[PDB]
Amino acid sequence: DDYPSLSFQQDYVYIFSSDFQLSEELGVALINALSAKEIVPERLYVMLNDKTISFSFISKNKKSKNRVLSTEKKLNYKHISEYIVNEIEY
């Protein structure tokens, strides 16, 4: 196996990444953002790699929303959080 191990678990957030620093920053930002917009996911999985970023948003209705994002240079917690939160809320 080579997939990044889990690195952050809150109420509904799961984050697989080899960068524990970016995971922490990203999780709290998601919790904050989704609560501010009063959005309650049944579960939210996220995966961080060198090039790609992917997540799965499992709704309270158990219908999921999956996304992938490849990027030249790495992004930080705010850019990823705004991207994820933007896709979820649509």
């Binding site: 995966m47 790609t52 992917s54 799965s56």
Partner: protein, 126 residues
């Protein structure tokens, strides 16, 4: 006993307007599987090209949450008139492609699989 899995996702290039809309459908009758994938490419929000990819082979369970697929057939249909590929056809028909489960349920499953050299996704069961 056959277990069906289905899901969709959208790939987005951060350095371009290029993107995929991908619908995934898997059928597992025990030790073998049949995957059906439809990739609609959009550039500038315009249906550019499409791909229908059909797979077949063996799904081998290594550990309780660690699988891998061995394809014996891959079939690609595309538009006759002539980009990022989620996976290369040669890397599928030569290697074993790992799938690590991270959560199991009766309505859906969550896995980390080999598209884009690392992707996490949720599949609905039926």
């Amino acid at each position: 006993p056959v277990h069906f899995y289905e899901t969709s996702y959208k790939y987005q290039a951060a350095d371009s307007t290029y993107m995929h809309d991908v619908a995934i459908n898997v059928s597992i009758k025990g030790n073998h599987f049949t995957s059906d994938i439809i990739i609609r490419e959009l550039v500038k929000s315009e249906n550019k090209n499409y791909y229908n990819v059909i797979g077949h082979g063996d799904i081998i369970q290594k550990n309780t949450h660690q699988y891998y697929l061995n394809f014996d057939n891959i079939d690609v249909y595309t538009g006759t008139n002539k980009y990022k590929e989620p996976t290369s056809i040669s890397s599928l028909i030569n290697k074993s492609n790992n799938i690590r489960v991270v959560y199991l349920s009766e309505e859906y499953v969550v896995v980390e699989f080999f598209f884009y050299d690392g992707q996490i996704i949720t599949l609905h069961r039926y």
